[PDB]
Amino acid sequence: DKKSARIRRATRARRKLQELGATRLVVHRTPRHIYAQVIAPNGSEVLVAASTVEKAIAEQLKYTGNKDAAAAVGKAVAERALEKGIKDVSFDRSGFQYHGRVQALADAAREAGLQF
Amino acid sequence: MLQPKRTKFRKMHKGRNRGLAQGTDVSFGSFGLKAVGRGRLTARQIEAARRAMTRAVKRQGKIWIRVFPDKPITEKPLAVRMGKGKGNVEYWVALIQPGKVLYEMDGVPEELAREAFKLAAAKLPIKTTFVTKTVM
Amino acid sequence: GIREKIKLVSSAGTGHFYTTTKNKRTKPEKLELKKFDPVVRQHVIYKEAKIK
Amino acid sequence: MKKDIHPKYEEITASCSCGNVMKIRSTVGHDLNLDVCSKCHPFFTGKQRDVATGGRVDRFNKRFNI
Amino acid sequence: AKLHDYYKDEVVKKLMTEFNYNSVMQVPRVEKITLNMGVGEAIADKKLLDNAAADLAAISGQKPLITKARKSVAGFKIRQGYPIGCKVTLRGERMWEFFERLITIAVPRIRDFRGLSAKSFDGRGNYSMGVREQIIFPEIDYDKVDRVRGLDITITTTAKSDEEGRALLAAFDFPFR
Amino acid sequence: MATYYSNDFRAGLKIMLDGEPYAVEASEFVKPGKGQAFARVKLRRLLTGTRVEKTFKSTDSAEGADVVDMNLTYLYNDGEFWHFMNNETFEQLSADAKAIGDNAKWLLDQAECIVTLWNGQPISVTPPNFVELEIVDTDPGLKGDTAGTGGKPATLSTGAVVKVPLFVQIGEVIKVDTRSGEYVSRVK
Amino acid sequence: RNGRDSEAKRLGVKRFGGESVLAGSIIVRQRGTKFHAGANVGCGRDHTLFAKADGKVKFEVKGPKNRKFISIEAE
RNA sequence: CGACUUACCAACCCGAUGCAAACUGCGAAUACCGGAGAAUGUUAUCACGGGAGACACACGGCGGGUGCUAACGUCCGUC
RNA sequence: UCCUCCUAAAGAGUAACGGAGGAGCACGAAGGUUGGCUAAUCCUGGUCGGACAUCAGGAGGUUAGUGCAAUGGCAUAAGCCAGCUUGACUGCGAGCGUGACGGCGCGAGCAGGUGCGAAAGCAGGUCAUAGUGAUCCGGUGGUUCUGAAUGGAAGGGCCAC
RNA sequence: UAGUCCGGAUUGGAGUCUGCAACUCGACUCCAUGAAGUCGGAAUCGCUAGUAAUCGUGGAUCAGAAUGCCACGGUGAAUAC
RNA sequence: UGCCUGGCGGCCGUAGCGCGGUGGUCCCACCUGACCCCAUGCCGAACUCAGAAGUGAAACGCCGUAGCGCCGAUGGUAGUGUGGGGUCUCCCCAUGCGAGAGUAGGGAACUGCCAGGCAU
RNA sequence: AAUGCCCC
RNA sequence: CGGCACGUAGCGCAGCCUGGUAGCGCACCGUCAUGGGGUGUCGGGGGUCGGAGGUUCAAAUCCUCUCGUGCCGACCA
Numbered sequence A: 001d002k003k004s005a006r007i008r009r010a011t012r013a014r015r016k017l018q019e020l021g022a023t024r025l026v027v028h029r030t031p032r033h034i035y036a037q038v039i040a041p042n043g044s045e046v047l048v049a050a051s052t053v054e055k056a057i058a059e060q061l062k063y064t065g066n067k068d069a070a071a072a073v074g075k076a077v078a079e080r081a082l083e084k085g086i087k088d089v090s091f092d093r094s095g096f097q098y099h100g101r102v103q104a105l106a107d108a109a110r111e112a113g114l115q116f
Numbered sequence B: 001m002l003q004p005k006r007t008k009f010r011k012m013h014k015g016r017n018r019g020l021a022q023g024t025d026v027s028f029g030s031f032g033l034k035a036v037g038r039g040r041l042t043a044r045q046i047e048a049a050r051r052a053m054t055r056a057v058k059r060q061g062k063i064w065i066r067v068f069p070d071k072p073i074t075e076k077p078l079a080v081r082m083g084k085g086k087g088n089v090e091y092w093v094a095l096i097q098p099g100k101v102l103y104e105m106d107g108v109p110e111e112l113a114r115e116a117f118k119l120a121a122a123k124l125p126i127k128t129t130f131v132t133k134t135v136m
Numbered sequence C: 001g002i003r004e005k006i007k008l009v010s011s012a013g014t015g016h017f018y019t020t021t022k023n024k025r026t027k028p029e030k031l032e033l034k035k036f037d038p039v040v041r042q043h044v045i046y047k048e049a050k051i052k
Numbered sequence D: 001m002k003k004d005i006h007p008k009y010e011e012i013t014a015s016c017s018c019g020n021v022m023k024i025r026s027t028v029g030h031d032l033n034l035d036v037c038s039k040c041h042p043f044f045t046g047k048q049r050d051v052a053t054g055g056r057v058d059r060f061n062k063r064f065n066i
Numbered sequence E: 001a002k003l004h005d006y007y008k009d010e011v012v013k014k015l016m017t018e019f020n021y022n023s024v025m026q027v028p029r030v031e032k033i034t035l036n037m038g039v040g041e042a043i044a045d046k047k048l049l050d051n052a053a054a055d056l057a058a059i060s061g062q063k064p065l066i067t068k069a070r071k072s073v074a075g076f077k078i079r080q081g082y083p084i085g086c087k088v089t090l091r092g093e094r095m096w097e098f099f100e101r102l103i104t105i106a107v108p109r110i111r112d113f114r115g116l117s118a119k120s121f122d123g124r125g126n127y128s129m130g131v132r133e134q135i136i137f138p139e140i141d142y143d144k145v146d147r148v149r150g151l152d153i154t155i156t157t158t159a160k161s162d163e164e165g166r167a168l169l170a171a172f173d174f175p176f177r
Numbered sequence F: 001m002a003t004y005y006s007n008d009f010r011a012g013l014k015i016m017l018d019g020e021p022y023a024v025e026a027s028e029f030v031k032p033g034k035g036q037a038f039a040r041v042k043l044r045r046l047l048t049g050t051r052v053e054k055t056f057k058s059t060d061s062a063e064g065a066d067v068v069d070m071n072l073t074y075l076y077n078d079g080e081f082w083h084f085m086n087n088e089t090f091e092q093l094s095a096d097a098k099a100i101g102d103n104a105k106w107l108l109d110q111a112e113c114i115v116t117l118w119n120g121q122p123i124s125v126t127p128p129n130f131v132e133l134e135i136v137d138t139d140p141g142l143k144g145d146t147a148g149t150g151g152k153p154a155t156l157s158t159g160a161v162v163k164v165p166l167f168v169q170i171g172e173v174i175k176v177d178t179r180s181g182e183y184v185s186r187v188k
Numbered sequence G: 001r002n003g004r005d006s007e008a009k010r011l012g013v014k015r016f017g018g019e020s021v022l023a024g025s026i027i028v029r030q031r032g033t034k035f036h037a038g039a040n041v042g043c044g045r046d047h048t049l050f051a052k053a054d055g056k057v058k059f060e061v062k063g064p065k066n067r068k069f070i071s072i073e074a075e
Numbered sequence H: 001c002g003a004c005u006u007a008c009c010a011a012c013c014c015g016a017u018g019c020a021a022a023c024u025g026c027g028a029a030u031a032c033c034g035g036a037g038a039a040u041g042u043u044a045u046c047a048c049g050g051g052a053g054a055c056a057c058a059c060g061g062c063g064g065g066u067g068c069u070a071a072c073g074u075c076c077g078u079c
Numbered sequence I: 001u002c003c004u005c006c007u008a009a010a011g012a013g014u015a016a017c018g019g020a021g022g023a024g025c026a027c028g029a030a031g032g033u034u035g036g037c038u039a040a041u042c043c044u045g046g047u048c049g050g051a052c053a054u055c056a057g058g059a060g061g062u063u064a065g066u067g068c069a070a071u072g073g074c075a076u077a078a079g080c081c082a083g084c085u086u087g088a089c090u091g092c093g094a095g096c097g098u099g100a101c102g103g104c105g106c107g108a109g110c111a112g113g114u115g116c117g118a119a120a121g122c123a124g125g126u127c128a129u130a131g132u133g134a135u136c137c138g139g140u141g142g143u144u145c146u147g148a149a150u151g152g153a154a155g156g157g158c159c160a161c
Numbered sequence J: 001u002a003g004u005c006c007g008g009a010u011u012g013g014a015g016u017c018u019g020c021a022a023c024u025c026g027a028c029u030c031c032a033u034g035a036a037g038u039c040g041g042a043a044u045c046g047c048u049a050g051u052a053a054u055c056g057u058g059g060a061u062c063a064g065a066a067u068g069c070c071a072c073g074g075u076g077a078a079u080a081c
Numbered sequence K: 001u002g003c004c005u006g007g008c009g010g011c012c013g014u015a016g017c018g019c020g021g022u023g024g025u026c027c028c029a030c031c032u033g034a035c036c037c038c039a040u041g042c043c044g045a046a047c048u049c050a051g052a053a054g055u056g057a058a059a060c061g062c063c064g065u066a067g068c069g070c071c072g073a074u075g076g077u078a079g080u081g082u083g084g085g086g087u088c089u090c091c092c093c094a095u096g097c098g099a100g101a102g103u104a105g106g107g108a109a110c111u112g113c114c115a116g117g118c119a120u
Numbered sequence L: 001a002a003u004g005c006c007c008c
Numbered sequence M: 001c002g003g004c005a006c007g008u009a010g011c012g013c014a015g016c017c018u019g020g021u022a023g024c025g026c027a028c029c030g031u032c033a034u035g036g037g038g039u040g041u042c043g044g045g046g047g048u049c050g051g052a053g054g055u056u057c058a059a060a061u062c063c064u065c066u067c068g069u070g071c072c073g074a075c076c077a
């Protein structure tokens, strides 16, 4: 039910983003992995997804659940988005504290170009 | 003398008494006294009918009182003008619609129940009738 | 009716002032806040004072 | 564990009359002398002497008889 | 940590062969030992509560949390929000150190120890017990102390029933009986 | 200072009629057949402490006053003034000779005595009903030929004089009722 | 000891379903959020749902709790 | 200090039966708001200006409060 | 005089010396923001301790709570806890609601200048509805706007008890 | 200078003796237990010298059963205007 | 493409509970450890951080099951608009609308985007 | 030269 | 009828305003004094607020309803 706790933590900001109709960048941090994907303002369709389950990153990395891996997948997702033409998003920490791995992903994305 | 132990509010609107009745099935006992008319029974009339029927069966069998006076009826005093707030509660009443079974009884033969209900109904302002239990 | 009203005079040298109420009994210490002062269009500290 | 909040907590030696030495971390500060530890307490050879049931007719016939 | 190593090496396999467990994760393991000292006299004297807190910080290795009146009860002239207790949670190496200290020093030192109950077990395995004098812990000295306090221990386990919790403490040769 | 009307105030109110605080003790409202209504109030002058009788007109009326009473505790006397304090606000306060009239001999120290203050200022203090006091002076009682009880005059550490039975000597604390000025017991 | 009612507050729905609406016009006046705000509509400090764009009012029943939603179809 | 017997009362739950203007896990007919269309209607609609009167109503039907489901009673809504 | 429910006839409104209750405030945090948390009550085990304190677990599910009456609402919590703060800002205001009128209420958005947040953003008081008194007359501070020949001033005006 | 190495009441256990017989109801001994009591309210009592105060001893009664009663000595005062 | 698993939805109980069974290659969860980032009104419990020895026990997912919950009739049985009538406090007739509860039954959800393993 | 009542 | 102000130990009264303790006098119990009774002295005990329901953490106290006892008038017709 830690799941339900953090989902309740996320729900408010998620619905505010829903209402503002902004393209939101969501993360989802597990112990052994970290994910990211930008989802169209309607919320049902996803634009680009970058994850540390992908071989293209899992090979370059040494351990998957740590801050440098988070920065790597953040770089990956911001690059894929900017290539697809998306450059203005909003960050949806999806319940996790904006700190450590998630903050690292966010800084890497900001650095790679995603204005938010 | 039946009367609610507590009520949320002391006085109640007059209201109307339209429609048929709800508890129109003899369920508990084997015979019942179904009302055919329509009006309002009082706690006094209910108690009088109960006394009549229980004495007629001589403390035998089991009876049920399927109605309960919850409506508080109020009256103004005498020689008082017509304004100046609602009255004050005098007695309690149970509105009756056609078909509402009033009393129930089992454990006594059918004819003895007939007589007991006759002696009871002779003290009720509503026209009533005897009804028996039915399957389904 | 225990809650008197006060004026928060500006510390920007003007005579501008707001006006609110304070419970003089439980909070005897003066009220100091930073409110917008429109005569100089800055946020300056405001120090309370008597209505007079 | 915060820094200045909690008290000192160091490894302290505890010696009993059972002849058992025990290295324990505790707040006692100095060394420690025990009188009774777990292994010496009269708990497993005491459940009879700490009740003392006995029998009065036995006491009587031992006191005297026919 | 001596008792913890002992647990990991003997007790897990002993409980395995005892209860015919299939996964090692099934074996009951303790999680926290909670220490509580409810000082009702604190509303009369707060310095009493402070001294109780100090004694608890002595008995354990941690500063205690000052519990406060959840509700306002007139039967004891406590108003909601009053500081009336102390609490210490012990997890990990601190829990194991206090557990060892307890069952090896304090239980033998308690006055007229004829054994602890085998039926104070919450029905859910979690054991709890109480002491009547805080001097039974060698950390505090009876010439230094002024008032004799008490407290109660609470051994929370992941035992489904209480039979397996008691069997766990027995594997730890807890001195209850 | 909400103005009060005659057929409104019952006992307990502190009316302020004619630059002077009062205190309604009793009041009888009358509405006779065919005439203006009135109230016969049994007022109480709250400064000299005399009970005045006033028949008030339905219409005739008066403003209220800040006369209030609560439990102050005596501290000390200095010159012509008596100082007391609260146990729930700890607000300091000073009275005068007029307020403490004839209760000077009843208050010792730390006595918890109800005081009436008006305009945020005391006007009358009420000594606790029973006060423990010590006797400064007495004539060693000698029964002599007394056949009845006899009694004996005895000054106290605060100047007062009370009749004490016969045995109370000097340095014995007694208990007196401020209300009657009389001996109750010798507190051991 | 009675007869002290209060002034009627004129709550209720002001623009019903499928009704053209300029931005800033009240749709419902209420006490609590009996109707919640949806697309292009706001929620005042006293829970009056107003319009934030022009278009046609629509009433919805979306939600996991089966709540009532006011939305504006921006036409 | 422990207690043994048992003609009464019985909360909480479970089954069954009713009641409510200030009860609602349901819920119409009408009425009300908005849009579209044909026919009809001496613009019947709205705005601005000149002139008013009137603001004691009554009874009959329908929905009610009060009264006694009394009054050619009384107070409302609608015709 | 004002607020809440019913009467009130499923839009709004609707009377009676009809049925029930409340208000004439409180708060500089009980406001703003960011982060986090989820109750009442029962059962069991537990030092004094007990019907009921504090501790632990379980069942339960918002029967709890909301500064204050009742109604509607509240879990994204509007409830509870903590950090930083003063948006309890100034000038306006598309457009609506509600009034015979005096008026009263809601409000996105613009400009200046702040607060919290990494940011998206939120903030011109408080879950909402009671907590109030028109005009005259006069007081206080500001302000060149006027100032009875002229320069001042008195006194008026404009802005904020 | 402490409810104490004061006080010994009460109670548990174990015994001795007298006596047909120590349960109701003896006395004494041993071990343990260690109440109240920190100089005593109004009132009240005895005593003028080997007296009061204090310390022991014996006897009658009597198998056993006295802190009572009757005697004996040891130390030995204050005051009487 | 077929099945598995993650996230974000759509929908808001025919979608939820309960009982039985089952899942660890991957994913997930528990897990290991704690100087460092960070944290406890005490507690690495939680929140974090550094990892991968063990386990699917708990949780989570999935399959089954009709003990509940839930849905629910075409269709048949109260009220009511309009007109008329009566024995008029309450009903009837013509006409239009037509429930609530209950019955038969249904029911162990359906689906969109993008991501990781066997066949192809 | 304070008080001091009564006894079927 | 209303309004209204009472109901607290055996009796008579306080308290209540401004919530957290129930007080005062007489009486009552046991000594003492006395030949004995009384006066007197020394000590002791006793109630929980007519009742019920609310507000509250908590009600003698605050609200509301009941029961009982007093007081005022229930007039112009």
Ligand SMILES: [Mg+2]
Pocket (backbone or CB within 6 Å): B021, B095, B096, B097
């Ligand atoms: Mg009926």
Ligand SMILES: [Mg+2]
Pocket (backbone or CB within 6 Å): C019, C020
């Ligand atoms: Mg202001």
Ligand SMILES: [Mg+2]
Pocket (backbone or CB within 6 Å): E124, E125, E157, E158, E159, E160
């Ligand atoms: Mg458990």
Ligand SMILES: [Mg+2]
Pocket (backbone or CB within 6 Å): none
């Ligand atoms: Mg209804």
Ligand SMILES: [Mg+2]
Pocket (backbone or CB within 6 Å): none
């Ligand atoms: Mg209507």
Ligand SMILES: [Mg+2]
Pocket (backbone or CB within 6 Å): H043
């Ligand atoms: Mg025309």
Ligand SMILES: [Mg+2]
Pocket (backbone or CB within 6 Å): none
């Ligand atoms: Mg006109």
Ligand SMILES: [Mg+2]
Pocket (backbone or CB within 6 Å): none
């Ligand atoms: Mg009319």
Ligand SMILES: [Mg+2]
Pocket (backbone or CB within 6 Å): H068
């Ligand atoms: Mg009649």
Ligand SMILES: [Mg+2]
Pocket (backbone or CB within 6 Å): none
């Ligand atoms: Mg309406």
Ligand SMILES: [Mg+2]
Pocket (backbone or CB within 6 Å): none
């Ligand atoms: Mg009208």
Ligand SMILES: [Mg+2]
Pocket (backbone or CB within 6 Å): none
């Ligand atoms: Mg009022």
Ligand SMILES: [Mg+2]
Pocket (backbone or CB within 6 Å): none
């Ligand atoms: Mg939040």
Ligand SMILES: [Mg+2]
Pocket (backbone or CB within 6 Å): none
């Ligand atoms: Mg308990």
Ligand SMILES: [Mg+2]
Pocket (backbone or CB within 6 Å): none
């Ligand atoms: Mg509730």
Ligand SMILES: [Mg+2]
Pocket (backbone or CB within 6 Å): none
């Ligand atoms: Mg808030």
